[PDB]
Each structure stands twice: as C-alpha cells, then as structure tokens.
Amino acid sequence: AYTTFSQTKNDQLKEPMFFGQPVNVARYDQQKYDIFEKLIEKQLSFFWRPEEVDVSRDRIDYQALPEHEKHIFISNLKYQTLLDSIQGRSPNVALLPLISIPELETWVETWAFSETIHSRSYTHIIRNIVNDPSVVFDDIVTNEQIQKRAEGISSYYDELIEMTSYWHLLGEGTHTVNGKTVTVSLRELKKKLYLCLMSVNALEAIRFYVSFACSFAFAERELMEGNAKIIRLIARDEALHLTGTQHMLNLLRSGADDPEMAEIAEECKQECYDLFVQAAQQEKDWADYLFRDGSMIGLNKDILCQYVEYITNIRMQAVGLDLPFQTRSNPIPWINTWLVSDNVQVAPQEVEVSSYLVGQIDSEVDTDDLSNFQL
Amino acid sequence: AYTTFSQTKNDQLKEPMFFGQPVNVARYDQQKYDIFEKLIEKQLSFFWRPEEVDVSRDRIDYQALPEHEKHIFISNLKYQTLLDSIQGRSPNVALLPLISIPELETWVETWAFSETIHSRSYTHIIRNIVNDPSVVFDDIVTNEQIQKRAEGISSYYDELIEMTSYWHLLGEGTHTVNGKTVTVSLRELKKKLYLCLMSVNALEAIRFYVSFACSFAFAERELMEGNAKIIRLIARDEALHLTGTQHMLNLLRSGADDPEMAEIAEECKQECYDLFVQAAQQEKDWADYLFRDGSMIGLNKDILCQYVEYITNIRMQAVGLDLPFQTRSNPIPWINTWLQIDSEVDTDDLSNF
Amino acid sequence: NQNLLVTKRDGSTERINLDKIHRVLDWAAEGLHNVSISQVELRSHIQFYDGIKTSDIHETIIKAAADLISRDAPDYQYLAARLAIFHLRKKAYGQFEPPALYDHVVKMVEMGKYDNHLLEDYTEEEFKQMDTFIDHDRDMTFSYAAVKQLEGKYLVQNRVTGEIYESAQFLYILVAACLFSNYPRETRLQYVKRFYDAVSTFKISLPTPIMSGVRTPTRQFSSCVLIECGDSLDSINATSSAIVKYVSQRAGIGINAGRIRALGSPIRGGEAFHTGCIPFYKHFQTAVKSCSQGGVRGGAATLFYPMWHLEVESLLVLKNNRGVEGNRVRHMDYGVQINKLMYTRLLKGEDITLFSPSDVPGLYDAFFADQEEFERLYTKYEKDDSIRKQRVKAVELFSLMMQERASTGRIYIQNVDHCNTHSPFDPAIAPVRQSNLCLEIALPTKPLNDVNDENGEIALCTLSAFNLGAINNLDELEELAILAVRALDALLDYQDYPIPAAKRGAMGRRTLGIGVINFAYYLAKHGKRYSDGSANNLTHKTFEAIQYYLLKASNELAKEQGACPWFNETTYAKGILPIDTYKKDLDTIANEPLHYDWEALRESIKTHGLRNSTLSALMPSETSSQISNATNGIEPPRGYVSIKASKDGILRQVVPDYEHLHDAYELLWEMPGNDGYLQLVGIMQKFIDQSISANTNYDPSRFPSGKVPMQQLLKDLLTAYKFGVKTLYYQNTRDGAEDAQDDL
Amino acid sequence: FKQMDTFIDHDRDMTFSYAAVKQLEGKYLVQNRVTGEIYESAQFLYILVAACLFSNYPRETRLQYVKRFYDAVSTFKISLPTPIMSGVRTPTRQFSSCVLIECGDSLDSINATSSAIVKYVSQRAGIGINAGRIRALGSPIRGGEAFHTGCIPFYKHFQTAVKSCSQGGVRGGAATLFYPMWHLEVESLLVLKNNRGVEGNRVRHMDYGVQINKLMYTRLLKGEDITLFSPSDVPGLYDAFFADQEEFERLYTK
Ligand SMILES: Nc1ncnc2c1ncn2[C@@H]1O[C@H](COP(=O)(O)OP(=O)(O)OP(=O)(O)O)[C@@H](O)[C@H]1O
Ligand SMILES: Nc1ncnc2c1ncn2[C@@H]1O[C@H](COP(=O)(O)OP(=O)(O)OP(=O)(O)O)[C@@H](O)[C@H]1O
Ligand SMILES: Nc1ncnc2c1ncn2[C@H]1C[C@H](O)[C@@H](COP(=O)(O)OP(=O)(O)OP(=O)(O)O)O1
Ligand SMILES: Nc1ncnc2c1ncn2[C@H]1C[C@H](O)[C@@H](COP(=O)(O)OP(=O)(O)OP(=O)(O)O)O1
Ligand SMILES: *N[C@@]1(O)C[C@H](n2ccc(N)nc2=O)O[C@@H]1COP(=O)(O)OP(=O)(O)O
Ligand SMILES: [Mg+2]
Ligand SMILES: [Mg+2]
C-alpha cells in the first residue's frame, strides 16, 4: 500500500528511482543523481509569468492576419493548451506514487508546476488575441484533429495509473476480482512505466517543438512578437523537461538503477520505436490539417513535415533508438535563434528580454572584505 | 476508471468540486469559484527562493547558543521539515485524482510546488547552521517524538488514497477480491476526503504556527535573523494554503456545491472536532517536549500552550466548529509583526414599435 | 515547373518562370564569395504554390538568403541585403533605377511626405547638383540588418498601407540638404556634399529621430527628453502632458519623480493624505504606452528616485515578475540615485535612513548640489525624532537593489555625486538631478507647473555617433566632428517644440550628445581586448582626441556664430575642463599622457566660449549601429553572428571584418568578469561630458556554486563608483538556455 | 445673528432618525478628524448654510429669505448634497459632485482631459468622459505618418488618471466613459469590463455608456446589419448622431 510517509529509515542514495520504498523525508543536501537537482535549480531560476510581456501589438497583428494564418496560430495554441493541461496533472498521478528518491519527486512536482504556468500562458495569449475566447476554448475537447493528436499520451498515462493502483492495492501475483483473473506483475508495470516515459519524451520533444516552430514562423515575418516571446519562454522550460525525461529514460536503460529494467527496455527496441514512428505520423497529419486553407511564407506542409522528420531523428538518437528517417539537416535553421539565447541580443527598449534568472544570487555578503575598500 | 484526459466536453462551470468528471482542459477565463484563481495568482505573486536570504550569521549565532536552546531550534526545524516533506507530495496524490474543476486542480499543483520550495528552504537552513545535515535528516525519521505525529498525519492521506484507488478500480458497490468482500461507497469516500481536508487544515493552521512562534522568538532576541527571514515567507505561503483549504471545507460544508457533502459534514461534527482537539493536544505535548531541559527568554511551556489554544480556537471557529477552549487574547502579540443568460431572439420584434 | 501560376503585381496572372528568380539572385550575387544561388533556390522553390504573389516570392527569396547567414558564409549578409534593396526600389518607384532627385522631391512634397521648405530653400539647379552628388550604388554596401531597419523604421512610408516612398540615398541626401538649408548659399552645397559623403560612407551615424524625420514635415528630432516632476498635482499633470506630447514625436523620456512625497504624507497640513507614488507611476506608464514613437516603435521611459526615499523598498521591486497589478509597474525602467554617503554606510555596515523628500527641507537639493551640505543635513535629520523616517540595514537595501537588478536587468544606477563634480555644468546654478532613458544624458532640468509654464526647463538632447571602425587615424576626427557639430547645431534651429519649456532648455543650453560606435571592432583591429587591460591607453588616447576635437569644433562654431546663451552657467566658462575634474583613481590604471594642447583650447574657450554646453555622450546605438553594420556603442558583441531581435525583425548580424579579425574579437560571454570593462568605461568618462551607457554582464556558470555571488555584484558596483562611472545600464545574464538543433 | 437665534428651533433636532443622526455625525457636522470630537449641532448647520447661501442678498429681504430656507431645510422639505453641507459655512470652497468632460480627437485634447480628470478626482468628484470621438484602431495619423493604436490605450490612461489619487491603486475613483454604438471598435469596447481578457485589453475600473439612436433600434427590429465606422472617417456623421436624426440617416446611408 502506498504511504505518504514511510516509517522505515532507508538510505536514499541506494534506492532505485522507481518502484522502491516511497520517499519519506525530502532532503536536498545529497542526491543519488545530481542531474535532477540541477534541473530543479534551473527550472526555479527560469521562473516567469505571461504578465511580464507586453502583448498590445499582438492583438493588432493577429486581427490583420488572413483567415488561414489565424487558423494555424489558434489551432497550435489550442493543442498546446490541452496538452499542457494534461501534462500539469499527469506526472503527479502517474509518477509520484512510484518515485522512491526525493530529487526525482521534487523534479516531477516542479515540472508539473511549470506546465501549469505554460497552460496559463497559452490561455493568456488566446485571451489577448481573441475578442471572445469562449468560442475558442470550447472547440478543444471536441476538435477531431486535436483528439487524434492527443490520445496517444493520455492512453499510456491511464494504463500506467491503472496498473500502479492495482500493484499498490493487491501486490504482485494472481488475484481474483469479481471472479475475473487479474495478474499484477512488476515486470509489466516497469514495461508500462518505460513506455509512458517514452511517450512523454516523444510529446515534449517533438510535438511541442513542431507547435513552437509554427508559432515562431509568425515572428520570423515581423508579426506577433510578444506571443513569440511567451512561446520562447515556454520552450526554455520545455528544453529542461525533455532533458529530464531523457535522463530518466537513459538511467533505466543502462541498468544503473535496476538490472531488470535494462533487459525490459531491450525487449522494447520495436515498441518504443513504433511509438515514435506513430507520433511522427500524427504530426504529419497535424501539419496537413494546419495548412489546408493555405500556407505561410517560411512554413508550409512540406517544410513542417521535413522538420518533423529531422527532429524525430534528433530526439530518437538521444534515447538510444534507430533513426527512422533520412539523416538530413535542419530545414528551418532559424529555429535555432529561438532555442539558443547565447548570441541573442534583443533591443530591450522595444521588446522584452527572455534571458533573466530569478534568485540565482549566492546572497552571501562579508562586510569585512567590503570595509577594506577605498572609494 | 480515472482518465487523465476525459473526452467528454462537459460544462466545468456546473461540475462539483470533487467526484465529478475528471478535468480535461484548464480554464482561466472563467471559474466556478474565483477564490482558487485569486489564490493561484497570490501564490505566483509570492514566489521566492531560499537562496535570496543571507543566513551567514545564522551559523555563528547557533554555535553560540546554549545546549537547550540549540535543542529547541533543531527540534522545531525537524518538525517543520517533516510536516512540509509530507505536505509536498500528499495533496498531489490524495486530491488530484478526485478534483473535477480546473481551478482547484491548478491550485493544488501550485500549493504542492510551494511546499516543495518550503522543504528546500528547510534543507538550506539545516545545511547552513549544522556541520553535517545527516545527524538531523536521518534523526527525523527515527525520532520517537515526531514519528507519532507523522503517522497520525499521514494516516488520513493513506486511507483517502486507498479508498480512491478502490473507487477508481472497482466502482461503487460490493465486490470480491481474493475471497474477501470489499464495499466501495461514494459516501464513505466523501467522508474520507472531508476528514483528510480537515486534517490538512489543522496541519497548516495550527501545527505550523507553533513552530513559527518558536522560530520567531529567536528573531525577537536578534538571533538567527536569516532563519526568521525565511520563516516569514514560509508563513505567508502557509496563510495562503490555509485560506485555500478553509474555503474548500466551507464550500463543501455549505452544500452549495454538493447536496450530499452537507450531510457528511454534519456527521463529522464529532469526528472533525476530535481531530482538531487531538492536533491541539499533540502541539501542546510537542511544546512540553521542546522546553524540558530548560526554557527560553521569551518562550516557555505556559505561554506557548496559551498560544496553541488561542490559534486553534480562532482556526476552529473559521470552519464552523465549537470552540474547545476559553476565549483569550493573543499571549504573544509580537508574532503579529512577523505573520445564467439564455441567448435566443425571435421575430416578434418586427411587430414591436 | 509543376504548371504553377503566379499573381503579378498589376493583378494579372502569369506562368511560373524560375529563370527570372535566378536572374534576380545572380544580380544580388555579384562580387560575393562562398555564396551559392542553388541553396537559396532550393529553400525557396519548395514554398511556391499556385497563385503565389510575386511580392511573396521576393520575400521568400530574401528570407531564404537571410537564413543562410553564418560564420562559414558571412557574405550572405550582403546577398540578403541587396535582394531586400531590390524589393524596396520596386516598392518605391516601380523599377530599379531611382528617378531624378528634383522630380522625386516635388512628387513627395505634393502629397505631403516631405516638408515644403525643401522646395523653397533650394532651386532646381541646386537639386540637380545634389543629384550629381548622389551615388545609388552605395545602397549595395548595406548589410541585411541595415536594410531591414531602413525598411521597417527609417524610410518614409505609409504606416497604414505599408507603401514605401524613398530609398536610402535619397534619405541621406535630403537629411544633409535639410540640415544645412539655412547656411550661406556660397558654402551651403559644399557642406551638404561633405555631410552626405560622411553619412552614406558610414563615418557618422545618425539616431532614429534624425534618420526617420528630418525631411518629414514633423520637425522634432531630439532623441532624449528629460522632464523633472515636482511634488504637485499641476506638476504631475504637466509631466504627463509633456510625456504624451514627446513620446508621440520620436523621443524617449527620463522622468525624475523622486520629489513626490511618500505614502501617508500629509497634504495641505492634514486635509488629505498622500496615497503613494505608485498610482502616479502607473499614470506615467500609461502616458508612455498610449502613443508610439512617431509611428516607429513603442515608447519607453525611465523613472529616477533617490535611494533614501521612504518608499524605496516598494519602488525597487516595481519591475519584477513576482507581484500583482496593484504593486507593479513593469513596463517602465527605473534608476536608483546613490551618492558617497550610501556607499560608506554599506562599507561600514551601518544603517541607511529613509525620509520623505517633503519632510526634509534642503536634503533633496543638497543630494545633487554639494555633498558636505547633504552630509550635514542627513546627520541632523537622522537625530531629529519629530521627522517621519525609517531605518534599514545598508547591506539589506543594497542586496534588495542588486537582487532586483539581476532578476529584471533594468534597475539602473546613477552616482549623483559623480554626475555633478565631473560635470560641464555648475551644481550651484544648474545641477544635474536625473538622466535619460538609456542613462547616457546628464542635463539640468527644472520642474514644470503647467505644460505651457515658462519657468520650467525640459532638457533636450540630439545625438550622433562617430564610427570608430571607419576612421584610419584619429586626426580624421577633426573634420567629421565639425560636420557633426554643425549639423546638430543647425538641427537645433530647425526643430519645433511642442512644450515651451523644452524650447527654453534647448535654446539656452544647445546640448548635443556625440558618442561612438564600432568600439569593439576598433579594439579588435588594434589587437586589444576588454579584459586584460591592454586597451586602457588606447581608449585614453582615442577619447582624448574625440573630446578635444568636439570642443574645438564647438569653440569655432561659437566664435563664428556667437556663444551659447547659458554658457555662463557651465564650468567651461570658468576655464574648467574635463581633464581637470576627473576622478584621481583613474591615474592608477591609465598612464597615457595628453597629446593635444588643452591649454590653448582652454584659453580659446575662455575668450569666445562653446556654442554647445555638452558635446559627448556614449549612447548604446542599439538600432543606429545596425545601419553601418557596427558593434553597438562600446559593447562587445555577443557572438560572431549575433541575433538582433525587435518588432521590425529578427536579424542575423556578422561582426565587421569577420574573415580577418575573428580571432581578435572578445565576445561578451568570454570575458573573465567586469573589471576591465569598468576600467575602460571610467577612462572614457574621464573625457566624456555626459554619462556612458555602461553594462554589467554576469554568467553564473563561471562561479563554483553556479550562482553569481552578491559579494561580486557589490564589489563591481563599488569598483564602478571608484573609477568615476556615473551610471550603470542593463545587467545582462547568461541564462544558459540551449537546445541546439543542428544537422545530424 | 440675534434674529437668526430667535429663528432657530432646536426642537427639530428630535425629528431625525438613528441612521440620519449617524450620517450627520459621520459626514455633516464639523468636527476634528484627529480627536474625533464634534463642534456643532444640526440646527446650527442648517441655519448657517442658509445664512452663507443668502449672504450676498439685499438687507431688506435677506433675513426673511434665510428664515424661509432654514425652515424648508430643517423640516426636510429641500435636500442638498453632502458636499454642500460639509463645505458651506466652512472656509473651503470646493463643493464637488460630478463633472462632464468631453475629449476631442487630438493629443492636446487627450492631455487636457487627463489633466482635468486628475484635478477633479483629487476633489473626490465623479467623472463623465465622452471619448467616443477618438478615431478607431488602424486609422491613419497625419495621412499615414503613424498607425493609430486604438482607443484602449487612451482609455487606460484615463483610468490611471481616475485612480491617480486612489489609495491602494484602485479605490474611490469613479468614472463613466461614453462612446457611440456604431464605433468601429465597439465590439472590443463592450467587453472592456469582463474578466475573459488579459490586462492589456481590459479596462475594468471604469464604467461605460453606449450611445444609441433610432437607426440602431430599427435595424435591430428589422434584423438588418449595423455598419461601424471610425468617427474620423465619416465627415459630419458624429455631429449628426446627436443633432439631426434625418441628416444622420442620410449620411449613414451614403
Ligand atoms: N513570371 C514570374 N515567374 C516567377 N517569378 C517571377 C515572375 N515574375 C516576377 N517574378 C518574381 O517576382 C519577384 C518580384 O517581382 P516584382 O517586384 O518585379 O513584381 P512583378 O509581379 O514582376 O510586377 P512588375 O515587374 O511588372 O512590376 C521578382 O524576384 C521576380 O523575379
Ligand atoms: N537591373 C537590376 N538590378 C538589380 N535588381 C533589379 C534590376 N532590375 C530589376 N531588379 C529587381 O528585380 C525585380 C524584378 O525586376 P523586373 O521587374 O525588371 O523583372 P520581373 O518582374 O522579375 O519580370 P517581368 O519583366 O515580367 O516583370 C524587382 O524587385 C526589381 O526591383
Ligand atoms: N487628493 C489627493 N490624494 C492623493 N494625493 C494627492 C491629492 N492631492 C494632491 N495629491 C498629491 C499631488 C502631489 O504629488 C502632492 C502634493 O499636493 P499638491 O498638488 O501640491 O496640492 P497642495 O499644494 O494644495 O498641497 P501641499 O501644500 O501640501 O503641497 O500630493
Ligand atoms: N504617435 C501617436 N501614436 C498613437 N496615436 C497617436 C499618436 N499621435 C496622435 N495619436 C492619436 C491622438 C488622436 O486621437 C489622434 C489624432 O492626433 P493629433 O494629435 O490630433 O495629430 P495630428 O493633427 O498631427 O494628425 P491628424 O490631423 O491626423 O490628427 O491620433
Ligand atoms: N535618449 C535615448 O537614450 C532613449 C531613446 N530610445 C532608444 C531606443 C528605443 N527603443 N526607444 C527610445 O526612446 O533614444 C536614446 C538612446 O539612443 P540610441 O538607442 O542609441 O538611438 P537608436 O539606436 O534608436 O537609433
Ligand atoms: Mg503643493
Ligand atoms: Mg489632429
């Protein structure tokens, strides 16, 4: 049975990441894996709110758009809103009752909070650019393409939650529920957990980035720059989320946490693959749905499909998977100006700056060293 | 069965607070209860990090303290660390698979994140005031005088989670598992959720404020100023969380959200009161344990017990419960310096004028 | 082919023809190296559909060329530029060859695009001669960012229909002809030709108001406006009206609002009580954001207040993203004013006392005028128990200020004592109490009681810059400065003033700000860097030459055309030179002797005077440097191929002379820290009449804990004070966000 | 003064009610706002208001007029606003209330309107602004020299002017803004007060008044379409919207 606080004094530097003793005391002075500590620190320093970006010009630029471009922008915003609404609640339910180290638990909670901020920001953009947002938010759960591009994540989450509840409630073995035989296997639970993590990786690493490219193409045409700043701030945290999922998957494949997980993942060099191929195909369908009434300068169906294949290859190489597409280059190199902020110098008196950290100061002041200072 | 994304486009403005259709999309332009949106906005407007507070002098101040004051400080820090280590994860696990309005879901997520920030701040203080933070963190679990409260607090969460799992797995009715009969009832699960929410309200309303008083009494002595600076922000966030859970309990009790939870609240008039008085007694006994081998200049067993009784009276009136102690003013005033339209149009207007 | 059909500009429909696109690309590719037309065609043809407009084809090829700008093939920066030129000409005249200058001027004046006076002050023959001066081939020397800024910001255009009316050479020649319109007919055209050759060849850089409004019938070109707000409702209303009137006319605003009494302060002896400065700050913000800067960009303003203000803790956090609407004003920048006393209180670990400015008579005036009186009054008032005050820890206040400056990057510093002791103006008569939006302008101001009050004084500064990357010798600054000064001075007699107080200030002081651009390119060409301190002597010599030649030009202009009307209020009138009042600590880091005869200049200034009160001020040149493809101001470039982002585009800019000088460049995030840059800034401030837009840059990955230490921030602040740095501009931070998507 | 004293009837003080007396103490009778002690009774207030109002009257009929007005007011037959009762007979001369300010389609007019709003809210006076003449978003400025960013930024400026002297940012500032129904931005102006929008596109602390005439009502009755124009693009339509209905109909049709 799951317990919020476990009365056994375990050593948390020797516990597995998942399927161990549930965490009791939240400590941050020592981590089994420091990568999650760094991710939490970076996410905290990356704090932001949509209210800090002036979006007055975004209304004017949106109302002057042709119908087809408005359709593209609003469809990407609606999909992102729904998926980040899902991503706000899903880690806390699927992953929290399975995590057995404090660092991963805190990272999952911080990641969920970041997704709530992202959903608020998408809603903020929609409220700003649309004079009646009720007509837009109501066409989200009923949109056919949005549903077709979203079930392949909630399904895996639901399966993981279902058999996690079964495991926490019955234990390993064969049991009889209402006369039906239910088998609870920790191997199957580990397999579902790996599959769900691989689905979340695919989502946050490919689908959200396709939507990001769609939103950034408008800013490349000197249109809707404040929404672009908001989306760039979102992508800044999305990089951290995909890095965290990638590390979670790679630590379960090398066997450094559980020797069984390595062979379980080896039994998934087709399933995990098939899932990524299906996600790429779903993105191709989404790209066809976006550019149905027309295309836009710098972005059409062919370019977005090429980018889908490129990013799928790039993010599948990072999790030890074969490349399902031709090894090519980036068809839209300008996206690199929206995800790498090292050489980006924005005009601060015209547009907002997206390169600020919150509370990244050591705060230690020694008055003795400052006293010996001649002004 | 719980689903992360429910395909039915329900009207979230008429859904119940809990036990309705699981939330699918988050709405910020409209809320059934705006209080949770205001709470989320206030929490985001109070965002802080432990690294923004200088705690360099805290080590020197702690090293110069007498043994019995050091004991009080470290026991208070251990209690706060355990309480917020629980409160970090517990709302995200117990309440998330039960909420059916987006605003409450978002508030619960933000509240859990803020509790994680509190835990990080406690770790920061412990690491900055003690040579090795192990002799405190590994002592938190085995400390006899804290584990009883740990069980008493986590039991409600665990029972709520277990019943929620049976409800989501089997549904309402009588079922047979491994030859034993399990009765899953929505009334029983509602009672469990109400009891858990009352336990959370007692935790963030009473248990944390005693420790706040112990931490602030050092501040009134111009000692451990960085610790006090951190605890001030923690207390602000606590007040926010307490307001949130108080609103949750009041809206469940009023019956304006669920015509069945009113009866459950009425039948908890003895169990909820027992839980609150048990929490007050536990804080009084914790105060007893704090000042055993000595006492502090501005804090002792007597005045701290009076403060516990005062704070629990005030926080028990707020959730519609009979006061269990005599009315008495605040014995430590210095702590107050540290805390629906149908849109249809016919063609009969042509024949108006 | 794919049997595709395009929509022509005249509305007709034609068949696809890739040969025309290839011909245009080859036209834009003349003389370029490592540029392939094939790649541009490959990235452009995939985006061609049925019924595509030819204008969209041009935009597609321009964008495809611009996306190829990189360190391996920097020459694309020209191919994407000429293409963008090709489109502008067709958008301006319907053809490539521009018309005759006289016909263009007449046609533009008819429809009201240009000022009528151009047709009155010049005859047809003079217009033909200026047409002879013109060389449109210079349009091929622009970079992609330069052309994008010209198209989106500077070229005369309809802001509603998007139609462009002129090219860049017409812009330059008409600015030159319109500045020197009133000059004697004998030497007028020679000055016009010399100024046009200076600007078109990128020797002198002009700011946005001048580059976008000199030929236009709206005649206001002061880049910087300084308005002082008084502790009065009438003063607040006048400040709001002046802000609205001047933002709409191509001007940024620096509001000094440190005189407004604190929250809770009595009004009229107790009849009413003040509600705080926050609602008035919100009023100022809405005044700034109501209009645009002449239909070019959004308005911006900076608020100034002393550090000892009673509400300083509330004002410090006004910018961060961690508040609500009732306690945050996030769309205006802020400047904290500090003197030696606050720094000493921080050093000694004592307390800082905050008063309401209305409750301490004389403290606010002595804050800027003289510091002995300020210390006496501050000490007196700290021991007075009948004055409302609040005591805070100096380390706590400074920590809060640096926390906010790090988190928002836009909490600027002004050392008021340095702004007055090392000032061209006399603190007793004309003290400096504030700065401009970008913290480079330091001019006297007087509060206004009415938008038409004549007792007030609003400071106006018109700017220009020297391209240090276009001068081969410092002596070349002799002529250019003259031109610059002359042009700017003529602009002062050409401009119109909506607020009479601004006219009073501009005609009394005649202040100009001439800065530099391409300083990083200059250092790299000389083989020096910011960090090691090798550039100290070179910076000393360069800025000594700049200040000497600016002063000489102003002195000649004064002895030819009369001295400045309020020249008696400046320290120059008493023989005091910038080489006299500089901070002495600068002697410990620079050993370079003066090369020019400053004694003869001092005697000449005493005898005749300066036409202008101020001449030097180092602006950031965020937008104007892009025209000449120059590093902005004195800031090192962030990358070899940097990205300039604005509402007018995301543009890839290559550092000048990247092929032969990439190893000699020092990029911003390759700097050990801030010591060398601050030393260079102090050496500059030794000679500059006004402040310098000096940035502080911190990368938290350069420290062991991954966090910038508060000790380092305070040490850098104290170091900047020690070397005489008047003001600190943006604090830039390396967030470390990197999700690289390069080829596999 | 002796004649007024014999005109005074202090028995009328016993005709007030408890809420009346509480309001009288709170805002009517002169008092010290620090010590909280009062100095005058109701009858003195009434008689002195009557005397001060009729001070510049001929001395043949001044006393009888004062007596009649005092009898009318003290009997509760004529009622006068709270500022009159709190200011008349006192050294102040600010007898505030509500002010109607019209704003033209000019920057000078906008500045003057904002200054007047600031000067009148500080006297705790309600504001009625007519900002319906401001041209719509996207209208040319100076023949295309600038792009108009709409009425919303100026409405926000007016709102901050109203709240400039308000405690806590937004507390006792009250204003009502008027615009015609046929304004080109009317769809974006009608939703200025609901929470469905962001702060950048919402002005929630000011009330709004939509101006309608016969043509809009008859188009609603017939189910036709209402056409919205920028007031600067239709010469004479804004003037005819109030003055001449037949002329407005002709211009609207044209
Ligand atoms: N028939 C065509 N097929 C393909 N591209 C064309 C064709 N005609 C013009 N273009 C391209 O369209 C771009 C823009 O051309 P341009 O600005 O001259 O407008 P236009 O439609 O050609 O009208 P016009 O030249 O008569 O003024 C050019 O780069 C040009 O190469
Ligand atoms: N001699 C030139 N050098 C550089 N660019 C040119 C030149 N002539 C035209 N251009 C540019 O090339 C584009 C098209 O030129 P042009 O109108 O002559 O041919 P086109 O429009 O492509 O085909 P068509 O002759 O059918 O109209 C325009 O943007 C135009 O400004
Ligand atoms: N009613 C008000 N509420 C809040 N602030 C006000 C009010 N009236 C004026 N202020 C502000 C405006 C100024 O910043 C400051 C000073 O008041 P002011 O405009 O000078 O009128 P005043 O001259 O009659 O009073 P004082 O003699 O005290 O300066 O107080
Ligand atoms: N720079 C600006 N940005 C946004 N709006 C502006 C700007 N300048 C003026 N406006 C608004 C204010 C008025 O509502 C409207 C007309 O302004 P106005 O002050 O009368 O200028 P103007 O007379 O020089 O040009 P016009 O004749 O077109 O009005 O446009
Ligand atoms: N006087 C100023 O400091 C402020 C003002 N300004 C600059 C940039 C923006 N977006 N708005 C403004 O109002 O101009 C000068 C600053 O000088 P520069 O920034 O260097 O001039 P320029 O690059 O715009 O041409
Ligand atoms: Mg006054
Ligand atoms: Mg006008």
Residue numbers in the entry:
A (entry chain C): 1 to 375
B (entry chain D): 1 to 339, 360 to 373
C (entry chain B): 2 to 745
D (entry chain A): 128 to 381
Can you quote the paper on this entry?
pmcRibonucleotide reductases (RNRs) are essential enzymes in DNA biosynthesis and repair. They convert all four ribonucleotides (CDP, UDP, ADP, and GDP) into the corresponding deoxyribonucleotides. Finally, class I RNRs employ a second subunit (β) for radical storage, necessitating a long-range RT (~35 Å) between α and β subunits for thiyl radical generation. Subsequent research by Stubbe, Nocera, and Bennati using unnatural amino acids and spectroscopy confirmed that RT occurs over long distances and involves proton-coupled electron transfer (PCET) and the formation of multiple transient amino acid radical species.
